[model samples]
Target: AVTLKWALWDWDKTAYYKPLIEAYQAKHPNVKFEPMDLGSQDYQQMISTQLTGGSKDIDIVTIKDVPGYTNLVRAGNIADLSGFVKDQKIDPAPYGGLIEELTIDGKIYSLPFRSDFWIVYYNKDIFDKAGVPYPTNDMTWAQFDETAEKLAGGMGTNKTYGALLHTWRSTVQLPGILDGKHTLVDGDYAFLKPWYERALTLQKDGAIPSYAFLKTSNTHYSALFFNGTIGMLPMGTWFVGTQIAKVKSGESKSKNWGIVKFPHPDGVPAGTTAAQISGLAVNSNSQHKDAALDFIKFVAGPEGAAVVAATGTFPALKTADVSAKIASTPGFPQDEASKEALIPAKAYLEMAVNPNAAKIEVVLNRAHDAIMTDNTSVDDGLKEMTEGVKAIK
Candidate 1:
C-alpha cells in the first residue's frame, strides 16, 4: 500500500491531527502515514519553499490560511482537485460553502477540514462574584461594553479585568464584518472605526487591558481566563480543545466558565461571527499524489467532521451531529446558551482569497499594532491601512 505524508505544525499539541490519521489508518490498515513538522510560524512559507524546490516528502499539505493557499495556487505548488473529486465520487456538499470559497477561478485546489468562528468565553465565577447577570446569547457589542463595564473591579494581583481581547488584528477589525457589507481586503476600512473606538475606550477605562500591556506582558487569553483574572474573551473554537484539556487536567482555574455566541453589530443577526478556515491540499510535487488525495478526501467530509468535533475542535461541516458531539465533550459547558452558541448562524471569512492577500496582510497587521498601542489614532491608522492596501502591487 502507498504511504501518505501529512504536513503539520505543532503536531504534538494539536489533538485532532493524530486522531484523523489513526482513524484513516484503522480503515486502511495496509496504508501508512508519515508526518513532517514544517514549523508553526513560517509553515506556509516552508511549504512554498520546499515544493517550489521540487521536494516530494510532503504529500499532503496543511493549508494554514487563505492567503497562503492563494500563493500556493498562484505558484502551482498545490494540485487542482477537479479530477480527484470526479474520480473519487467525492461529495462537496459537506464542507458547507467553504469548498466554493476555496476555489480559485472556478477551480478548487484545496479542501477545508477546520473552520473556526469566534465565540465569547466567559468566566461564570467572576460574573457571579460581581453579582452581574451572565452574558446572554444575543448580545450586541454595545451590550457587551455595558456588561463589561459593570464587571470592572479588583486591584493589584486580584485585579478583575472585565474582558480580554487578543492582539490579533481580527480581534478589533473582524467584528466590523458581522454585517453583510465588508471584507478585510475590500479596499475600505472605515467600518473598523467604531470597533476600534470602543476598544480604545475599554482600554482607557481599564475595562480591558491595554494592547501595549498585553503585548509587552506576552499575556495569552487562555492564561488570563484560566487564572480567573479575566471575565470574558472572544476567541475562535481552536481554543475549545485546549480549554477542555487544560480544565480537565486541573491546569485551568476557570472551572465555572461558559461560552456564548460572539457579539454582533446592531442590525446583524445574533450568531454571526468572523470565520477562518484551514484546509488540506495535495502537493503538486508529491510522489504519492493518489494516496494524498485519498486522505484529504476522507478528512474533508462529514465523517472526519465528527472525529474533529469529538476532539473538541470545529470542522468545516456545520452539522447537528458534530455540534452535539462538540458540546458534550468533557469540560465543555452544558448550559443551554453554551450549546446554542456551538453553532454560528452565519460565518463569513475573515480573509477572502485575493492575489494580493499576503501584501495586504502586512499593511493591515502593521496598522493594527500602531492603532491599538495608541501610537496612532484610529482615524490615522485606518487611513494608512486603506492607502497601504490600495498601493499593493
Candidate 2:
C-alpha cells in the first residue's frame, strides 16, 4: 500500500486526470493518490523548486510542456524510467515516431501521457449559410485558401470571417514543416516565408483578423468560434473536449461544428500534423519510486490511453480501439473525415525537445510578433530568426 502525491496543475479543469487516477485505483485498490495543484501560471518553475526543496512527498509530476520537461530533466528532478519501461516489455510501436522527443542523452526521464495534434475545426452552420461546401478529409492548403476566401465577406458586427488564423506563430509555421524538411531550430528560416505570406494575405484580404487587432483586443480563438464569427479554426485537438462540452450545454452559439485533418502539402499524407505532448515523470525525491514507475507505465500504456481517449483527449499510445472510442464521444462529429483525422500518419513535435528551447522560443516569438504586426518584412524577419537561432546553436 502506498500514498502518492501527484504534482499537477489545472487539477479541476482537466477531464482526464481525475478519471485516469480513478482508473488506476480501480486496479490497485491499496494504492492511494493525492494531487498537488500548483496552479497553471508558473507550474514548471514551481514544480522544479518544490522538487529541489528535498521533499520526498511528491511521487509523480506531470510534464506540462516540452521546455519544462527539458528543464526538469536537466535539473535531475525527474527519475530515470528507461529500466522500468524495458522490464515491463513496453514496446515502442504504439508511441513510435514519438518517444525520442522526451528521451535525452539516450536516457528516458519521462513518458508521454497525452499527445495533442493540430486539426481544422469548422462551423458547419457557417459553411451551410455561406452556401460553401465543407472542408474535406484530404484537403490541400490551396483548397483551404479558396474556401476561406469564398466564405469571407462583409464587414462589421454581423460579418463572418472565412477562417481564423490565431495570433500564435505555430498557426503560420506548422504547415511548412509538414514535409519534414524545415525545422524550427534549423537556423534557416527562408522556407517559412510562404506560410507568413499566406497569413499576411488572409489578414490583408480581411479573411482573418489582423495580429495587431487580435493582440490589442486580447481575443481568444475559442470566443470567436463559439460566437459564430469564425467559419473555420485551425487549432490543437485539445480544443475538441471544450467544444464538445460547450456545444452540448447550449453554451456555444456555434453549435453545429465539425473537424477535419489539417490541410496538408502536396506529397505529405493527409493526417500528418504538428503535435505537442504532455508527459508524466516520477519525481527523483519520491520514496515510493517503484509504485510511481508502475503508475506511469500504466498511464503511458495503451490501457490508460483508452481512458484518456474516452474523455475526448489524444493519448500517446493509440490503437484502433482507442481511435474508435474517441469518435464515440457524445458530441464528436459523425462524419468519416473527422474520425479519419484521429489517426495521424505522423505527429511531428511542434518544437523539438532541446535544452535551448526556452531561449530559442523567445527569439522566434519576437520575430513572429514583428512579422505578424507588419512591423518587419517577411524576408527581414526570417533573417533575424536565422541569426537568433544561429546564436543559440
Candidate 3:
C-alpha cells in the first residue's frame, strides 16, 4: 500500500475532508491518505522552500489565490493541470474559474475546491442597538460607509467598529481595485487610486482604526475582524461553510453576523467580484501519479464538491441543483438569510483575466502602506504602486 501525501491549508479540513477521506479509504483499501494542513503564509513559505529542494512530502499540493499560481507555476514547482484536465473532464470555463487563471502558457495546474470572496458581514446586535438598517446588495460604498459611521463607537469598551479594514497591504483584497480583465497600466492606475483613498478615508472617518491597523501589526486582517471588535468584515462566501460551524459553536465570536456582497463604485464597467480558489493538484513528479490523479478527481468533482458545499463552501461546478443539496449540508445555510447574503457574491471570471500573470500582491500592499501613512497623497501612493508593479519580474 502506498501512502498519499496531501497538502492543504485553511478551512479547518478536519470538519470537512475527514469524511471524504474515510469514504475514499473504504473504496481504496490498498492506499493510505495522509493529510497536512498549513496556514496561508506557512503554506507559501514551505512550498517555496520545497521548490528549492528543502521538502517533498506533498504528492498533491494546494495553492492560494492568483499570486500563488502565477509565481509558483512560473517557477515550475507545480504541474500544469491543463494536460490532465481533459482526461478528468473539467471545463475550466464553469468550474471554480481559478483554474482558468492558473492556466498559464496553455496549461492548467490545479482545480478549485474551496474559495473566498468579498461579502459584507455585519454584527446583527450592533445594528439593532444603533437602529440602523441592514445592508443591502444595492448599497454603494458610500452607503456602507454611512452605516458604519453610524454604528461605530456605540458602547465605549464593547463599542463596535463600523468595519474592519483587513487590508494590511491589501493582498487578499485586490479584487476591489483590479478585477475581471483589469490590469494596472501607468495612467490607468490612477483610475483605481480613488478606491485606495476611500479605504483610508473610511478609516480616518471612524469606520476603522488607522493606528493599530494591519500595516503596523504585520498580522492577518481576518483575525481582527473575527475577534468581535469589528462590526463588519468583507469576506468571501467560503467563510460561511468554513467558519459557520465554528461561529455557531461559539468557537468564533463573530456571531450575530450576516453577509452581503461587496459594494462596487456603482456602474463601473460590469462591477467587480473577486475570490481565490484552493484545491488539490497532482505533483508532476509523484511516483503514484495514478492514485494522485484519482484523489484529485475525487476531491474536485461531484462527490468532493458536495462535501465542500456541505461545509459552507461554494463548489466550482455547473449543476443547477447543487445549491439545494448544498443548503441541506452541514456548515451550509438552510434558510433565506444565507441565500440572500449570497446575492452580492456574484460569479465573475477573475482568474481568466490574468492566467499566469505576474504577482501584483506585493505592489498592492506597498500602495496600501503608503496610503495609510498620513503624509502620502493618494495620487503619489498610486504612482508608487504602479511603478512598483511595473518592476515585477
Candidate 4:
C-alpha cells in the first residue's frame, strides 16, 4: 500500500480531516494515510520553513488562508495542480470564483476544500432575556450598533455583553471589504475608520469587553459565546461546527444559538459578506507525486465535499448535492431567514493575497492593536498602516 503523509494544524480539528481520508481510502484501497498535527499558532512559519527546506516527508499540506498559499507559491514549494486536475477530471465549476482566486499567474497552486463566510451568530437566550426582537437578514450596520448598545447591561461576575468581538483585525475591518469599498492593504482606509470607531464606542458602553480586558484574558471567542453572556457574535460560519461539538460534548455552558446574514452598510445589499478559503496542496518535494495528487483531488472534489459537508462546515464546492449533505448536520438554525442567509450575494476575500503578505500582516496587526487600544488615533494609525504597506518590498 502507498502511504501518503498530510500536515495540518490543531489536533482538535482532526475530526474534519480523518473522515475525508477514510472515505478516500474506502475507494482507493491501496492508499494509506498519515497526518501530522502541527499547532495552529506556529504552523504557517514552521510549514513554510519545512517546505523551503525540501522536506519530502509531507505529501499534502493544509493551509488556513490564501496568503499562506501565496507564500508557499513564491517559495516554489507547492506543485502546480493543473495537470492533476485535468487528468483526474476534477471540475472547478462547483467552486464558483474561488478557482480563479487560487489560480496564480495562470497556474493553479491549490484547491480550496473549505470556504468560511462571515455571519452573525446570536445567542437566542440573550435576545429573549433582553426582550429585543431577534436580528434580521436586512439589518444595517447602524441598526446592529444600536441593537448591541441596547442589549448592553449587567455588572461584575453577572456582566453580560451585547456582542463579542475577537481580536482579529478582520472583525472590524472586514465590513468595508465585504462591501467591496476597500481592499485589505488598500491605502484608502477612511472606510474602515468608522467601523473601528463603532467598536470602540461599544467597548466604552460595555456592549463589548474592553480591548485591554480581552487582550489580557486572551479568551477564545467560542468560550465567551458558549458561556451564554454575549448576545451576538459576528464570526465565520465555521463557528457552527465548533459550537455544535462543544455543546454536544457538554463543554459549553449554553446551547441556544442561531445565525443570520452579517449586517452590511446601506446600498451594499443584504447577504453580502467577506470569506476566506482553507485547503490543501501537494508539496513539490514529495516523493510520491502521483499519490499526493490523488489525495489532493480526492479531498477537493465532489466525493470529498460530501464528507466535509456532513461536518456542518461550508464545503468549498457549493453544489446542490453538497448543500443537501450540510442540511443534515445538526445545530443549523431552522428559521427561513437563517436558511436564506446561506446564499451570499458576493463573498469577497477578507484579505487579498500579495507577495509582501507576511510583512503587510505584521504592519496591519500592530496598527490594528494600537488603534483599538486607544494608544494611537485612528487617523495616525491608518496613516502609518498606509505608509507601512508602501514600505513592503
TM for every model, in the order presented, reads: 0.89, 0.92, 0.76, 0.85
What does candidate 1's lDDT look like per residue over 26-106, in tens digits? Answer: 998887888888888888788787787777878998988888888888889889997777787866564545676677687
TM-score of 4: 0.85
Scanning candidate 4 in windows of ten residues, the lowest lDDT window is: 323-332
Q: Which candidate achieves the best lDDT against the true structure?
A: 2
**lDDT of every model, 2 decimals:** 0.85, 0.87, 0.63, 0.81
Please write out the lDDT profile of model 3 over residues 1-393, one tens digit for every residue.
989887766537446678778778888988887876666666777666655663456687776665666566756777666767887676655453455445666777777766555567776767776788767655677677777777788556666778876654432234455344354422246765656666767777776866445656775645665676776776666566545677767766766666665766565422245655666676656777788888877777777767766655676653544556655655453346555444233344443334324456466656666667766788887787778767766
lDDT of 2: 0.87
Give the runs in model 1 whose Cα sits over 4 Å from its true position.
53-58, 82-96, 154-159, 285-291
Worst 10 residues of 1 by lDDT: 92-101
- Residue 104 error for model 3, in Å? 1.1
Q: What digit string (tens of lDDT, one per residue) describes model 2 on residues 272-368?
A: 8888888999988899998899899899888899988887788987668778999899888898888877877777889987778878889999999
Q: What residue pairs are clashing in model 4? A: none
Candidate 1 local lDDT, residue 25:
91
| Highest-scoring model, TM-score | 2
Model 3 regions lying over 4 Å from their true place: 1-17, 34-59, 64-68, 75-78, 93-96, 153-160, 171-175, 178-181, 184-188, 211-230, 237-254, 268-272, 309-335, 340-360
**Candidate 2 steric clashes:** 0
User: Model 2: how far is 154 from its true place, Å?
Assistant: 4.3
Could you give the candidate ranking by TM-score, starting with the highest?
2, 1, 4, 3
Q: List the residue pairs that clash in candidate 2.
A: none
Q: What are the per-residue Cα lDDT tens digits for candidate 4 across 4-114?
A: 888898867556688887888888889998887777887888888777667898899888788788888888889898877777777776675677767877888888988
- Candidate 4 structure lDDT: 0.81
